[PDB]
Design a binder for this molecule. Structure first.
Ligand SMILES: C[C@@H]1[C@H]([C@H](C(=O)O)[C@@H](C)O)N=C(C(=O)O)[C@H]1S[C@@H]1CN[C@H](C(=O)N(C)C)C1
Ligand SMILES: [Zn+2]
Ligand SMILES: [Zn+2]
Length: 228
């Protein structure tokens, strides 16, 4: 891994990196959150911010130094602080941001800054192609309510990488994390829907653990089964 300031960057694939920021919270110590950086021709795409604006500014600083390509857009995967805490750094830099319309509607209640554009989804969970233009390899899929009602997921076309955000925990997790905003009744089906939407993704990236195999999907579903 490459440490840059207080953030960590790990190359996952020729054009894909995972960014990691930490937030020190009393009683738990530093808590990592993961997002994605994707190079696509002559532009860069970002999945999720860091915990804060200052940390999210360091993501763009690392991009300028290590990739040196303009950041075309960013997608944030729900209105929990580890995913949208740094929206201002993106907007300050002039970067177009996209989120589930539900996430932008929930944002002020969550103390988050809403994205500048809203994504809507068909009944099968796939993004309406009109609302996700020029996304390149970013394939956005809404699995259904799980970790939150608005949580979305992103597969990376041309790779074996799919990003489950906070919906998916790794195979060695012993809880489903924060269920304060969770839909305990549809969580398991939402997790399996993510698995079905990207059936051939072998590397599963998630918010709060190192990249896992597809076991993380199945494991997460079966811990969510015990909540019904
Ligand atoms: C604090 C997280 C964060 C919160 C959330 O997304 O609900 C919010 C603060 O942004 N996402 C969360 C999640 O469950 O996905 C919660 S708890 C998370 C899971 N256990 C992780 C942990 O204890 N680590 C040491 C990594 C923290
Ligand atoms: Zn969350
Ligand atoms: Zn989280």
């Amino acid at each position: 891994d490459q440490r840059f300031g207080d953030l960590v960057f790990r190359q996952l694939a020729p054009n894909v990196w995972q960014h990691t920021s930490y937030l020190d919270m009393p009683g738990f110590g530093a808590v990592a959150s993961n997002g994605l950086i994707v190079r696509d021709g002559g532009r860069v795409l970002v999945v999720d911010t860091a915990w804060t604006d200052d940390q999210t500014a360091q993501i763009l600083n690392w991009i300028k130094q290590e990739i040196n390509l303009p950041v075309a857009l960013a997608v944030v995967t729900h209105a929990h602080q580890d995913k949208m805490g740094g929206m201002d750094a993106l907007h300050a830099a002039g970067i177009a941001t996209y989120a589930n319309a539900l996430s932008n509607q929930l944002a002020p209640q969550e103390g988050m800054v809403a994205a500048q554009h809203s994504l809507t989804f068909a009944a099968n969970g796939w993004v309406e192609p009109a609302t996700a233009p020029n996304f390149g390899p970013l394939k956005v899929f809404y699995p259904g309510p799980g970790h939150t009602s608005d949580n979305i997921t992103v597969g990376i076309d041309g790779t074996d990488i799919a990003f489950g955000g906070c919906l998916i925990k790794d195979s060695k997790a012993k809880s489903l994390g924060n269920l304060g905003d969770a839909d305990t009744e549809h969580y398991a089906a939402s997790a399996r829907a993510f698995g079905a939407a990207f059936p051939k993704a072998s590397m599963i990236v998630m918010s709060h653990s190192a990249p896992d195999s597809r076991a993380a999907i199945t494991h997460t579903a079966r811990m969510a089964d015990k909540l019904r």
